[PDB]
């Protein structure tokens, strides 16, 4: 239910424009209930016109200047049909590269919890994972800040994609 709340939120909201997304989000914020960003995403994807999807993806990637955690939702929400069109793939590749450069001191690979889904982004964008780790490493090499202990103890999990196994055995024996 609750349909007329949606029919009020998207009232004259041009989702193909940048401003209409923000207007719709403020209309969503006006009556504070049921906050779940993915629902707003999914509905706005359900309302975009034919042939203007890439404008939507670029706008929604730009407007909210997404933090580390939230970005996961957008990749999760895109319909499978949209994968058939090549402009969408190149736009998603650019948007993935933006994220990988903005947070180079905090991206890591973990067994406990998956902050950033490497495989899903790789499939949607067409960039292989061995390139994503290189994009992160070259941004680490350029950065002016010094590293902290948690960054230092998670670099081998990224560098290990480069090494031959005979070298990795030497690294293990050193460690």
């Amino acid at each position: 239910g609750h349909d007329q709340e949606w029919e009020s939120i998207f009232k004259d909201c041009d989702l193909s424009s940048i401003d209409g997304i923000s207007a719709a989000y403020e209309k969503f914020r006006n009556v504070p209930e049921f906050y779940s960003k993915e629902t707003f995403i999914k509905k706005a994807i359900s309302r975009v016109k034919t042939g203007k999807e890439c404008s939507f993806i670029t706008a929604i990637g730009a407007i909210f200047h997404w933090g580390l955690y939230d970005f996961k939702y957008i990749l999760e929400s895109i319909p499978d049909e949209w994968t058939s069109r090549l402009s969408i793939k190149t736009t998603l590749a650019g948007l993935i590269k933006e994220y990988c450069q903005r947070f180079c001191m905090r991206i890591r690979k973990s067994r406990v919890y998956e902050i950033f889904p490497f495989s899903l982004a790789s499939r949607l964008s067409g960039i292989s994972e061995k390139e994503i780790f290189g994009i992160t490493l070259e941004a680490i090499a350029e950065s002016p800040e010094p590293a902290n202990s948690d960054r230092l103890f998670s670099l081998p999990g990224l560098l290990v994609s480069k090494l031959e196994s005979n070298e990795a055995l030497d690294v293990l024996s050193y460690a």
């Binding site: 590293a147 081998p156 560098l159 090494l163 690294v171």
Partner: protein
């Protein structure tokens, strides 16, 4: 022949012309923060500001009235270039390039060596330009942060400048801890990468120094060789360096808290140069409210007489932040905790700089009088450790009617079998006999009242201040008539105090 700057008496006679009732510590602060230079003192006093504002504008991080940073400084440096001789302008540009790259406590000798400029020219340049720079001892400093950031962005050196600085700097590294600490950050800029890699990997030598400095050089070498290795594709060496560097970084982080929490020993086993360099590099971290660091910086400087003029100016800067914390709403204020350790270090700092009475007045401003007892035990422990008996006696006398401080002092003095000044004990015995005391914990356990009362009674007996009838009346007011619980729990904190109190009442 040479003509010499003002001494202390000349500065005092200068300052008393405008403010004929300034104290000695005002003379100290005004003499330190003006580099003993008469023109600077006159220029500052010409504004007819109030005294406290006149000192405050000479202190660290003053009021940032400039809405768009660096605007007047650009004009000042340009005007300084235009009026100088045709030989001087290259030296001015070289000094501007050199200040943009070094680590923040620069001795004038190393700056003179790497730049080739005579030291008196550097000092005259800094005296002409004024703030944000300062000269003291043989050291140059910045005193404001976004001014320093804009300066380091505006005048960053070129490749030929960097080559000259590296070539001049490298021979000095056999003797100076500073040069050995600075060099890798210049080599990363110069793109002498492979030399930096082999400098960190191999067992290259070090100057003779204490551990606190040697750790720094080791860590800096590792931290910059990691960047060079990633920039030249040396991935196996990069992984080995990351594994090696993690433990050193954690050890440095664990070392700085240990120095912060033990000011009394740290100020004694580290020389004054290291003490100034710790403050200059901003080594201590905050403790739960935004201006906390300046409380500890005020303390560690106050142990040295010759740094006293700086110490006050740091203490002055602390009372601003505390004031802000007092003006927050109650729910926000409940999230920024202030501990009793902070009150103890502030009390120690104020006692060193101003005196016992001014130290004692500030402790009465905190509302629940339990807090005076809490601070008093820590202050008594620190003073009794270093055998500073007469200072503790003066603090005990100056407490007045704030009896919680005295009851903490005597409780800590009893454990080490030290006497206490009988004037304060006579006065507080006279106050105890007629009115309630209860050192109430919020927890319903470890109520310290019995131990404090017993210590007071022991002290009064050993000095023959009181009669035994008074003692019986006082103990009878406080001992419970039915047994309390703690007599049958071996881990209850209270048990030994009750056993001692009942035995003393019985005998």
């Amino acid at each position: 022949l040479s003509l010499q700057t003002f001494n202390r008496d000349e500065t005092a006679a200068h300052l008393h012309q405008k403010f004929p009732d300034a104290s000695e510590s005002d003379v100290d602060e005004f003499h330190r923060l003006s580099s003993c230079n008469p023109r600077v003192q006159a220029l500052s006093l010409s504004q007819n500001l109030p005294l406290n504002d006149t000192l405050r504008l000479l202190g660290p991080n003053p009021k940032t009235v400039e809405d768009t940073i660096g605007e007047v400084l650009e004009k000042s440096i340009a005007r300084l270039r235009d009026t100088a001789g045709i030989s001087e302008r290259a030296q001015i540009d070289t000094i501007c390039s050199a200040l943009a790259i070094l680590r923040p406590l620069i001795p004038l000798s190393v700056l003179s060596a790497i730049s080739g400029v005579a030291g008196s020219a550097i000092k005259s340049f800094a005296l002409d330009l004024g703030r944000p720079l300062i000269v003291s001892g043989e050291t140059i400093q910045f005193f404001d942060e976004p001014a320093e950031t804009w300066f380091q962005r505006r005048f960053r050196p070129s490749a030929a400048d960097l080559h000259q600085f590296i070539t001049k700097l490298r021979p000095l590294t056999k003797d100076s801890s500073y040069a050995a600490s600075v060099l890798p950050a210049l080599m990363l800029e110069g793109n002498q990468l492979s030399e930096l890699i082999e400098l960190a990997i191999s067992s290259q030598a070090l100057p003779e120094t204490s551990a606190v400095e040697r750790r720094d050089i080791e860590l800096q070498r590792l931290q910059f060789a990691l960047k060079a290795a990633l920039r030249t594709g040396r991935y196996q060496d990069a992984a080995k360096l990351a594994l090696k560097a993690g433990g050193e970084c954690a050890g440095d982080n664990r070392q700085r808290v240990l120095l912060r929490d033990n000011i009394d020993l740290a100020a004694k086993f580290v020389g004054s140069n290291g003490v100034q360099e710790l403050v200059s590099r901003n080594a201590f971290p905050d403790t739960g409210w935004p201006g906390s660091r300046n409380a500890y910086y005020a303390a560690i400087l106050s142990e040295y007489p010759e740094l006293s003029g700086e110490a006050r100016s740091r203490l002055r800067l602390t009372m601003e932040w505390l004031t802000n914390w007092s003006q927050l709403p109650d729910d926000e204020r409940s999230r920024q905790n202030v501990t009793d350790q902070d009150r103890a270090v502030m009390l120690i700092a104020c006692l060193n700089i101003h005196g016992a009475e001014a130290a004692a007045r500030e402790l009465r401003r905190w509302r629940p009088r339990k807090l005076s007892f809490d601070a008093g035990k820590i202050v008594a422990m620190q003073l009794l450790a270093h055998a500073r008996y007469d200072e503790l006696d003066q603090l005990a006398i100056a407490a007045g009617n704030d009896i919680s401080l005295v009851m903490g002092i005597v409780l800590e003095a009893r454990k080490l079998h030290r006497p206490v000044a009988e004037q304060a004990i006579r006065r507080t015995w006279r106050l105890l006999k007629s009115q309630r005391v209860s050192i109430k914990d919020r927890n319903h356990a470890n109520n310290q009242t019995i131990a404090a009362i017993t210590g007071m009674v022991e002290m009064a007996l050993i000095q023959s201040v009181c009669t035994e009838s008074e003692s019986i009346q006082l103990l009878d007011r406080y001992l419970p008539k039915v047994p309390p619980y703690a007599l049958t729990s071996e881990y209850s904190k209270e048990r030994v105090a009750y056993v001692r109190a009942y035995a003393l009442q019985a005998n």
